[PDB]
């Protein structure tokens, strides 16, 4: 049996940790839901 | 029980210890969480149960307790925040600027963020606050890493 417990409010914070690429990526969604890497 | 609007710790004691499996949003009496992450398993919250409403496998959506509450989209240009709950580790906002997943059925927004499984269900959120979808659904690249889309479901 899963449970679940309180981790905090979703609040928008400024000044926050910026980090991460943005990167443009070639994908297919097959019928259980998993992507795949197509090129 | 606690029916507070929130980001929640999915966790699970069938194993070792208590091993967390994934994160949800709580929200409007709804739970929102990724599939993979419960596989359609009614929760638990303290001495309540949550039931599942609505699922889909290819989504990699399910709510429990009523229908899908999370309607915000991204812009596809703005700077997104993603509420990242790790596995025994404080919840922390990590502002990212998405990629673009190209799909025949169309884009999809894409966060490139380095964080265990037990991360899956994490709001991606927007400079209001609002969820425009949920981390934990994409795909692995030449490094290892994973690239998660932007997961949001459908208000009726
Ligand atoms: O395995 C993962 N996700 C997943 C598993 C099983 C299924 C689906 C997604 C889609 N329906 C079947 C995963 C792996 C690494 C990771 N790092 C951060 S979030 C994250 C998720």
Redesign the pocket.
Known sequence: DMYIERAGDITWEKDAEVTGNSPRLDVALDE???FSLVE | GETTDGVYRVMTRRLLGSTQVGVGVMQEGVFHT???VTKGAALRSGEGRLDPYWGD?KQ?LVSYCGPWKLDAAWDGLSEVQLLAVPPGERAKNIQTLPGIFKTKDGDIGAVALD???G??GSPILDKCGRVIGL???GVVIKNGS?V?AITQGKRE
């Open positions: 259980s839901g998993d | 990724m599939w993979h496998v990699d964080y265990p499984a991360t899956s981390y934990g659904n994973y998660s």
